[PDB]
Amino acid sequence: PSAADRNVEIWKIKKLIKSLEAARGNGTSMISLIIPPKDQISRVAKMLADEFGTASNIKSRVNRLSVLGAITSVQQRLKLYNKVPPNGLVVYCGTIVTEEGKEKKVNIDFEPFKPINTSLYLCDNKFHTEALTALLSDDSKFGFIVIDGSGALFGTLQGNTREVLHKFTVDLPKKHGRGGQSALRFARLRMEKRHNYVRKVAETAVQLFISGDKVNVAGLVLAGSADFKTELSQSDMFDQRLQSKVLKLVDISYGGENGFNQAIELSTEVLSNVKFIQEKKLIGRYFDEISQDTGKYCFGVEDTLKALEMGAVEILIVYENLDIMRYVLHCQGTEEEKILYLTPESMPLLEWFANNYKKFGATLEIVTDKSQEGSQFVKGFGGIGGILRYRVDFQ
Amino acid sequence: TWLSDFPQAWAETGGMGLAVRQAPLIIPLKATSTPVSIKQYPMSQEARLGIKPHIQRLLDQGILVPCQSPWNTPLLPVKTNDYRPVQDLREVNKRVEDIHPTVPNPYNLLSGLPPSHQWYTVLDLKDAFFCLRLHPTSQPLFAFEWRDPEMGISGQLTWTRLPQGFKNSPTLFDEALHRDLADFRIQHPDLILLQYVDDLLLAATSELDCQQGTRALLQTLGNLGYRASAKKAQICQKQVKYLGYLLKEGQRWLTEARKETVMGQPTPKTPRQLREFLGTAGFCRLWIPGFAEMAAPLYPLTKTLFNWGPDQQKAYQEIKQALLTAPALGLPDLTKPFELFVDEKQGYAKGVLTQKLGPWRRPVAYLSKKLDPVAAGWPPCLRMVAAIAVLTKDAGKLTMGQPLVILAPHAVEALVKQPPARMTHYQALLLDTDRVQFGPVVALNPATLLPLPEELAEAHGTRPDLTDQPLPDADHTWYTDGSSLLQEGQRKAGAAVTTETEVIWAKALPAGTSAQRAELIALTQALKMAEGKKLNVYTDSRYAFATAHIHGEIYRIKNKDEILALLKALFLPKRLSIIHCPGHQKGHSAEARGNRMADQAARKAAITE
């Protein structure tokens, strides 16, 4: 699990939901077969040939041909896969109108990430992509810290149903007891025990959320009453691993378990907007790389592909809507090369990266123009470039 | 029964009219005006004989009379062969002293109507203007010659009453009628009465209130000596036509005839017909969504080069489209709370004043206005505030200081607080929150300008409209390079800003500088000499591009000098596009021929100082 490598897979789901909805055939010509993990393969082989006899009786020539050729298509395809892999098998077969007229068999078959009970089979004039988009409801584990003079709470908000973890309090003196010491002798004891309390907060957060390798929590939100809602942000008493994962710092009163529930209610929008906040941080660090003149960046097409094949590039940052295509042909004089066009005189390049980023490099992140730093990245640098490991020449 | 009950009030039974309470009218002239005697048009016998019975009937009614004036004007026949007379009084109307048309436009006259009264009664007065007398001092003015070429009768006539064609007549009539009916307004409250020149509308609560009011009103008109049209009247109806506006049950459309006058004039091509195509549509601007932004391409042809392009042929057609799709508007009711949605784009405000009908919103108007130049220069959320402000000022005319819930695509209530000049004027009538209020952020229909089910901060901003886009106008193609490494001794230090054929600008630098500061200094300089000539600048060095294209970033780096010059130097040419094309500079298409030429300028023409 890499929360970055997963976000490209979820992008490739979003682009398959765009293209399958776009394409449409003619009469009952579109099979939307989804197999779970647990169900057997010859059971499905038996259930298809069942419907082949129910599609022998149809009696409507052209669509009767379309169903028989498509059920004949999936049975050949399903035979080359021995039983079911640990996630399942999602499938889409049917004939549809493409560009310039013509006919086009699409033929899709693959393994996603866990549709356990998803067992759907539907033949129709259009595909059925309701189960795939059901995979994109996954609100991740979101962390919470609330601090007050009396005590502190640690917990989790995973979507809507709420959770709580460690209830801990630390004593610090209230008001000003002006007994047998002096005016200022208590002021020193206030920072002492506050900074003590903050360190204990820092260590307790370091223990429960991280677990070990990879941080358990996908994103954190902070909240408090006094300097606790300033002190922790500015000073990196809080940094240790999880500081980068912080979404937004919230202002609250109360400071008990009802502070928890003000925070979750003021941070419902921000937890659902992971991609947008994480985008603006990733573009944020890209622009900081140019600001410091630290030469760990690149941009434009020919400079990017250089950073890719060299394997300097750590993190690739590409706009989802790249008009560019890549191209590979036999040419004149029987040879093989790569051009990458912009304007007219194969597939998209964003699609190519999505598949092969792991090969040389090798990290990918998809970005949008809605973000005001993302907007800058797009119309300024043409929507392509990335984070590198060291100083690069080019020219 | 209505005709028998009011014998004097109706034109068909009551005879000719005569406003008995109105004294004859003297007509003030300009100091520099004198009597003008025009040759009468030599007329056809077929026409002249066709006119005579109309003139004969006026003489018998005492309206026309013989005279011997030093003024004269012509007599134009008109129109089947049934020739009726027209005078043409242009040469008089030039010489006459103007009066101020105190008359407010038909719509905003109707804006003085409530939907509490849904029982109507419309009249119009036949040969209205003739009921006002003309003081003998003024009579000679309107003289015209007449003849009979089969009788020798070549002599002068003139008017005892107010003629038809004199410029001030509608206004002069309006005042007079207003005065005559102020008596009726005082002794009949509860009813609403609307007049504009020769048209009347009597609004009532029940059918009973209308019938009694109508009777009262008619009885008065006969007493005063005005004559109403028995044919074209509309007595005690729920639905009525008035001033080209169809009313019914608290709603207000345009009558198809009022549309037709705008729809039934050809593509003008002259500055008069164009100005008066906008003039005529002006009364209908309250039904057109976003009239200001629709009518943009035509206002430059007010006053001129008359290039009627596709953008204006489109704009002229969007208006007819909008007129054909003109909806019901509600009368302002003044008890309910009102709701003004607003949007702005391309320097043009546009929005809709609505209010509650059941659980729905039925629009009352479509208010739009262009943002004035100083405001049109401001950033997006600013220009959204201005628009709200402008439409709110105008809305006030219709709301009469009643509850008002503003909406917009950018929630900008927080902005009212912090503007880092002009805001005293706005904040006055925005944050005076006795009448005014904001409401939820929301998207609008490009078409209807009504809200959509759809849910930002106003805490942002930094950079211009810079792109990586060889702009479509294609102005100066300028290639920038520099050189501060060592060759055959010490560090060279030289810049250049060329084109594909010419040299344009070049120099040397100080002995110091850096390695790649050269490229900045050359680009800064390349961006100084440009202002209203668009420019696209090609950069050989890639450090130059990025730092220069980011944007514009404030900070809380150890080379601020050149940088802070570059950062500020970029606001200078209108619409800029910094591109970077070392792809490839080694080389040669119809593009990198000039990149090559900038690289050969900054090396050779560099060793001088």
Numbering used by the authors:
A (entry chain B): 5 to 349, 371 to 420
B (entry chain A): 24 to 102, 106 to 329, 332 to 448, 455 to 489, 499 to 599, 611 to 663
From the reporting publication:
Previously, we showed that MoMLV utilized its RT to interact with host eRF1, thereby promoting stop codon read-through to make Gag–Pol19. In eukaryotes, stop codon recognition is initiated by the binding of the essential termination factor eRF1 in complex with a guanosine triphosphate (GTP)-bound eRF3 to the ribosome. Our structure shows that the MoMLV RT interacts with the C-terminal domain of eRF1 via its RNase H domain. Structure-guided functional assays suggest that MoMLV RT suppresses translation termination by outcompeting eRF3 for binding to eRF1.
We solved the crystal structure of MoMLV RT (aa 24–671) in complex with the full-length mouse eRF1 at a resolution of 4.0 Å (for simplicity designated as MoMLV RT/eRF1). MoMLV RT contains an N-terminal polymerase domain and C-terminal RNase H domain connected by a flexible linker, which is not visible in the electron density map and is assumed to be disordered. Structural comparison of the RT polymerase domain in our structure with that in a MoMLV RT/DNA complex and a Xenotropic murine leukemia virus-related virus (XMRV) RT/RNA/DNA ternary complex, reveals that the binding of eRF1 did not cause a significant conformational change in MoMLV RT's polymerase domain. The catalytic residues (D524, E562, D583 and D653) of RNase H are distant from the bound eRF1. Our MoMLV RT/eRF1 structure reveals the full-length monomeric RT architecture for the first time, made possible by the fact that the orientation of the RNase H domain is fixed upon binding eRF1. Structural superposition of MoMLV and HIV RTs based on the polymerase domain showed that MoMLV RNase H swings 92° to a completely different position, accompanied by a moderate movement of thumb and connection subdomains. This movement is conferred by a 32 amino acid linker region between the connection and RNase H domains of MoMLV RT, whereas this loop region is not found in HIV RT and is relatively short in other genera of retroviruses. Intriguingly, we observe an interface between the RT polymerase domain and eRF1 within the crystal lattice in our MoMLV RT/eRF1 structure, but only between symmetry-related molecules. We postulate that this observation may only be due to the crystal packing, because the electron density of this interface is not well defined, indicating a certain degree of disorder in this area. Structural superposition of MoMLV RT/eRF1 and eRF1/eRF3 complexes showed that eRF1 interacts with both MoMLV RT and eRF3 through overlapping surface regions, suggesting that MoMLV RT and eRF3 are mutually exclusive for binding to eRF1.
